[PDB]
Amino acid sequence: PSMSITRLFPALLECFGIVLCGYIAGRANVITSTQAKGLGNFVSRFALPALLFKNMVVLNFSNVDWSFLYSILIAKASVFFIVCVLTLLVASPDSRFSKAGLFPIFATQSNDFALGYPIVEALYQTTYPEYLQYIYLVAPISLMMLNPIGFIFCEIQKWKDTQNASQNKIKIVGLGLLRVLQNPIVFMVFIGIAFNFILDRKVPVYVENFLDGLGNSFSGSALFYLGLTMVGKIKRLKKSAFVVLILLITAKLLVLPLLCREMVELLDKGDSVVNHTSLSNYAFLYGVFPVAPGVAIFATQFNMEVEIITSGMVISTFVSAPIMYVSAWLLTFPTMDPKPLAYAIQNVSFDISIVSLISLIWSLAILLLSKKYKQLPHMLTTNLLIAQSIVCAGMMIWNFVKEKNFVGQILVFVLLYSSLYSTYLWTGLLAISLFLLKKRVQIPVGIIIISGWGIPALLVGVLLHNGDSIDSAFFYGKEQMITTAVTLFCSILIAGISLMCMNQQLTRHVLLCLLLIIGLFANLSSCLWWRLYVELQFFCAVFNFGQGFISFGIFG
């Protein structure tokens, strides 16, 4: 196989676990924001330049696939151009140039060294080791090609804000270009290239241990500092800022990886289908890396668009975790026969149910201990999150019970499927409560709760076979798909109608409902449908078990 895809979930757990460590440490004030800069300086001024220098000196340029680099770089330049032109057209005069600077940098600059490299290493270290080189070429060449342009627009803004000025364009260009040169990523690549040539790629035996020690310390240290910097960074954005942020995160995490993939398929005219495919897949995963923390640092250095950029970088980081897991598996499925693919979807489900369960336990613990479970709409959220926890238990039980008895499968299917219908129902009932709350009303909490669990249990009672199935979604056949479908059509209608009525704390609950409704749509589409089917089986499994992670992201 082209990707060791089984190595990705541990690598994401490493990455986002160490980010979560840093986030917990900042939240708990184990480290204050001023103490965090001590780690940030080590990370950025010592560990990163050592890592860059080391890898640059070792790098065999007579084995670089320049067509991959040109592809990713043209893809980034395209997204930069698109976001820049589109920003200049859409943004208002008073900050169009800061936006046209920072939004294209945001949309293109990846978290390549801290998050990209551990993930690439996990996937490709054994199967395609030269792909690890391209982190160190794409990420710096990306900066020195695209960042000066964005900085030039920030210097144009700074010039224009200094309204009395009439100063020269060459100052703007040189000053933007100099900020690129001053970046450790850029200058240690020039230096590392110089010592690649001087040293015939041999790092000196007596300097190698130092460069190992500093460079190897980078990854965890950077991920932890990324966690610390993520604390307190998502501010309540305006509607327009939130839509813009969604668009820019879509640029970074959807448009850019699609263009990376397309460009590799244009420009890699090499012969081997397997090499072409794995490189194409790597192009997509490369595009999926979150925004680099450096962009937020630039925004702070310019004092421009800082809330959008900082929030978006944080949100991009959190959103990249599932997108990257989901994408990498999705891109692996074409290479898998249908039974290895069935077990792959259960492995995905198990992996997702682990994180979701942990996130749900935390979310429930917060809602219970804060006693927010006594309030509305939070009590309905609490019931939804209980149902989501029982779904995640259902998956981990199903993983081990999947073909191992018969009546056990019925009890494992019974509780798990009833909870899955409940998650769907509570998604609608939650939106209903938001409408009723926004209306003023004596809200019928007891009826809402007992329906949100009893209607699911009655739906499964009505359903109560396919005993040999690996996938629980078909364990009671087409009649299960019908019962699931009607449940989803109920919940989608109920939720969409009640959110529409609501449109005539509570805002976060609307965001949860929107995101879950998009998920219910996937599982309804997949039920209405019954390679694209295995892909939406993945999106259904992903949602069915992973919905608790969305709940956590919005309440945590």
Ligand X SMILES: O=C(O)Cc1c[nH]c2ccccc12
Rounded CA-CA distance 341/328 in Å is: 14
Rounded CA-CA distance 475/464 in Å is: 11
What string marks each residue from 252 to 291 as x (binds ligand Y01 by CB under 6 A) or -? -xx-------------------------------------
3-state secondary structure 251-293: HHHHHHHHHHHHHHHHHCCCCCHHHHHHHHHHHHHHHCCCECH
447 annotated as ligand-binding: no
232 annotated as ligand-binding: yes
Place of tokens 């390679």: 531
Q: Which is nearer to ligand Y01, 250 or 375 (CB)?
A: 250
Residues in contact with 499: Cβ distance below 8 Å, sequence separation at least 6, in sequence order: 431, 434, 435, 510, 513, 514, 517
Tokens of 165: 């000025």
Rounded CA-CA distance 198/466 in Å is: 67
195 annotated as ligand-binding: no
Q: Give the distance between the most distant pair of CA atoms in the chain.
A: 82
Distance of closest approach, residue 185 Cβ to ligand X, in angstroms = 7
Interacting partner of 293 out of ligand Y01, ligand X, none (Cβ under 5 to 8 A depending on kind): ligand X
Number of residues that bind ligand Y01 (CB under 6 A): 9
Rounded CA-CA distance 37/211 in Å is: 22
Q: Which residues of 189-215 are buried (b: 16+ CB within 10 A; e: fewer)?
A: bebbbebbeeeeeebeeeeeeebeebb
Pick one of 8, 11, 25, 43: the residue that binds ligand X (CB under 6 A).
43
- Give yes or no for residue 292 binding ligand X (CB under 6 A): yes
Pick one of 287, 293, 428, 519: the residue that binds ligand X (CB under 6 A).
293
174 annotated as ligand-binding: no
- Give yes or no for residue 249 binding ligand Y01 (CB under 6 A): yes
CA separation, residue 199 to residues 48, 57, 59, 89 (Å): 21, 8, 11, 49
Q: Which is nearer to ligand X, 226 or 255 (CB)?
A: 226
Interacting partner of 253 out of ligand X, ligand Y01, none (Cβ under 5 to 8 A depending on kind): ligand Y01
Interacting partner of 491 out of ligand Y01, ligand X, none (Cβ under 5 to 8 A depending on kind): none
Pick one of 150, 294, 452, 553: the residue that binds ligand X (CB under 6 A).
294
- Give yes or no for residue 246 binding ligand Y01 (CB under 6 A): yes
- Give yes or no for residue 377 binding ligand X (CB under 6 A): no
What string marks each residue from 96 to 125 as x (binds ligand X by CB under 6 A) or -? ---------------xxxx-----------
Pick one of 18, 23, 44, 147: the residue that binds ligand X (CB under 6 A).
44
- Give yes or no for residue 52 binding ligand X (CB under 6 A): no
Interacting partner of 281 out of ligand X, ligand Y01, none (Cβ under 5 to 8 A depending on kind): none
What string marks each residue from 299 to 318 as x (binds ligand Y01 by CB under 6 A) or -? ----------------x---
Q: Name which of 243, 343, 285, 249 is nearest 116 in CA terms.
A: 285
- Give yes or no for residue 391 binding ligand X (CB under 6 A): no
Q: Name which of 222, 221, 228, 224 is nearest 32 in CA terms.
A: 228
Distance of closest approach, residue 176 Cβ to ligand X, in angstroms = 19
Number of Cβ within a 10 Å radius of residue 546: 26
Distance of closest approach, residue 530 Cβ to ligand X, in angstroms = 42
233 annotated as ligand-binding: yes
Q: Which range, of 152-160, 187-195, 248-256, 519-527, touches ligand Y01 by CB under 6 A?
A: 248-256
Q: Name which of 112, 161, 175 is nearest 141 in CA terms.
A: 112
Distance of closest approach, residue 224 Cβ to ligand X, in angstroms = 9
Is 452 within 8 Å of 383 (Cβ atoms)?
yes
Q: Which range, of 88-96, 246-254, 261-269, 412-420, touches ligand Y01 by CB under 6 A?
A: 246-254
Interacting partner of 315 out of ligand Y01, ligand X, none (Cβ under 5 to 8 A depending on kind): ligand Y01
23 annotated as ligand-binding: yes
Rounded CA-CA distance 192/203 in Å is: 10
Rounded CA-CA distance 94/61 in Å is: 45
Interacting partner of 91 out of ligand Y01, ligand X, none (Cβ under 5 to 8 A depending on kind): none
Is 384 within 8 Å of 430 (Cβ atoms)?
yes
- Give yes or no for residue 222 binding ligand X (CB under 6 A): yes
Is 251 within 8 Å of 260 (Cβ atoms)?
no
Interacting partner of 189 out of ligand Y01, ligand X, none (Cβ under 5 to 8 A depending on kind): none
Going by the DSSP 8-state scheme, the letter that residue 200 receives in this structure is T
CA separation, residue 409 to residues 217, 399, 527, 545 (Å): 47, 11, 21, 18
Q: Residues in the site for ligand Y01, rule: CB under 6 A?
A: 245-246, 249-250, 253-254, 315, 319, 323
Binding residues for cholesterol: 9, 23, 232-234, 508
Contacting positions for ligand X (CB under 6 A): 43-44, 48, 111-114, 222, 225-226, 292-294
